[PDB]
Amino acid sequence: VLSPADKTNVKAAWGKVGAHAGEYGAEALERMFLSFPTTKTYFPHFDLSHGSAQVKGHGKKVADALTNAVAHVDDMPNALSALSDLHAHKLRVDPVNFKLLSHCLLVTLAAHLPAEFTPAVHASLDKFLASVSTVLTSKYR
Amino acid sequence: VLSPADKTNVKAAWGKVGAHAGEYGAEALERMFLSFPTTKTYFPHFDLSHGSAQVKGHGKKVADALTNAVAHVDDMPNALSALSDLHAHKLRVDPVNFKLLSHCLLVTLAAHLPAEFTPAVHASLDKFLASVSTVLTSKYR
Amino acid sequence: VHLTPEEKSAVTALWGKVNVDEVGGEALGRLLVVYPWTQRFFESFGDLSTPDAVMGNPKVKAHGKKVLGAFSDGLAHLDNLKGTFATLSELHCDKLHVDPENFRLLGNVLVCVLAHHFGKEFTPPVQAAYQKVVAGVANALAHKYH
Amino acid sequence: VHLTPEEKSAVTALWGKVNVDEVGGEALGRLLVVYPWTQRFFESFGDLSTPDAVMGNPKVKAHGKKVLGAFSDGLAHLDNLKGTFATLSELHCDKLHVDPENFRLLGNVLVCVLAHHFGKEFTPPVQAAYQKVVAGVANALAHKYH
């Protein structure tokens, strides 16, 4: 749902992310891959090694995908509509795998924003990403 | 989301349920309680024994709650809006617990409708109940 | 897998009836149909586009059959499920890389199939009896994940 | 809990710094705040209405402290986590009746807290190192559920 209180947090916690947005998007990934190995099976064509420009590039891609979502929160389903098909249909990503990346997306934010990642804002994002992951596995329900 | 193909199944699989609706609602519960014990902690005031009229009564209640949802599918969030608060706020039901009851709701349908519970309709309902459980744990996201 | 002796008779008496042939594929198929992302491990099985194609697919009935062999197996080795499934574990884990959450789903569809075929005989106590088994099996396979 | 010796040094060196006092409650609190349904087990702790009330609550910092004792404990007994947590298991299981899914969440918030306090030192390899531990602990407690 996202109370106007959450979307403000999200919107305030993300602005602080700024241009680092794409870097954090690549850091989250690396985290997911090292932490939850079973996710590497989706990225065979990727060189999941530490400096991997591919992982760097998709990190930017994932970053922008969320930005699109923040700046269009009061209507995520229409915005990420596309991505849903792409992940739900073509790629067939196990829904679980979204809960993991969502975890590593916060583990990355928290290790970068020590002043904003308060318990309240921590929950806002968890909610945000939960909705983002709902939308993407929507073409499943 | 629910493709018009799903809502037809759901709508067709449920009509067959008819007046037994409330009985199946009470059977599902019994199934959840015996199968997943950790759910009995929500119902202390209930006499979760086999013939329990309370479990019978709430079985009717849960039944009608879904019916309300079938006959108002293209708008579940507004319909069950109330129930969301009641479960998400007052009762604070662990979201997991919805995946379980949803399971026992199908284990009950399948043991009652051997002609309609086809793989296709099986998926429709799974989707339906997934949306029903999303809505209720919406006041969480 | 504790299993009171009365839960044993429930699981025992019911299983021995199961069409160990058809039931296997009936489960695996519905898994691919109701939980689409699973299909990502059986592209090699052929057309899995419609449900009708998944339930008619010879590769599916041939695999589900095996999958049920693993159950019947573990069902007569509750005392030690990890060892029984030690190999399969490693396979599904550090080889296929299947998320353990999926071993609960499969077990859960199996329980739906069993409800579909025995309708009213599959009482609530007999369900919770199998529900223990499904988790039991579901965990032995997720072992190698430590 | 296998843990290569290099993942050991990662987990080792980091932990010894942890404010074993504050960190405990920092986790448990955020659990109650970000996953509201958890709160259903600490009504007895007092006002848990706003986040500010949960993070100021003396009952919470006193419990999280203990909870971290269990970690530090298991963290120096990986070799055998089930035994270490045998008691706690039974308690959380056939007594409190807490869904094992919640033991993964708590472990997951803990990993967020640890990321919050060590920011950049908490590198991706050190996270996956703790991620093993959290599952390891998370499973030993869900044992009694068989």
Ligand code: HEM
């Ligand atoms: C937080 C949710 C997610 C978002 C925001 C996200 C976003 C995207 C975006 C933007 C693209 C690239 C689209 C393009 O430029 O064509 C994409 C591709 C892809 N995503 Fe994700 N993704 C998410 C989660 C995941 C997860 C859970 C996995 C799997 C573990 C994953 C696997 C893939 C794969 C394999 C591709 C195609 C990669 C390629 O061929 O370059 N994504 N995703």
Ligand code: HEM
């Ligand atoms: C399929 C989703 C569910 C639906 C359709 C459903 C529906 C309802 C309805 C209709 C009521 C009664 C409202 C009233 O007459 O005041 C209710 C009450 C309640 N529900 Fe559910 N419920 C669902 C899942 C659950 C789950 C997962 C649990 C817990 C395991 C649960 C626990 C409760 C409790 C404790 C009450 C209050 C009981 C009482 O005091 O009589 N429900 N629910």
Ligand code: HEM
């Ligand atoms: C109760 C759980 C399960 C049981 C008992 C089971 C059992 C088995 C058995 C008996 C084999 C084949 C060994 C052989 O051919 O000699 C196997 C292989 C395999 N399993 Fe499972 N399985 C389970 C869950 C799953 C799930 C949930 C998936 C993943 C979505 C899966 C994917 C595979 C795959 C793809 C192979 C194929 C091997 C081939 O290409 O021939 N299994 N499983």
Ligand code: HEM
């Ligand atoms: C890594 C996981 C966890 C650890 C290490 C942990 C550890 C502990 C310890 C050390 C105790 C108290 C024993 C004593 O006072 O002597 C305890 C008690 C308890 N735990 Fe946990 N716990 C974990 C997860 C959870 C979760 C997720 C919940 C449920 C939402 C929870 C709810 C409780 C409750 C309510 C008690 C309170 C006992 C009292 O009233 O004093 N714990 N736990």
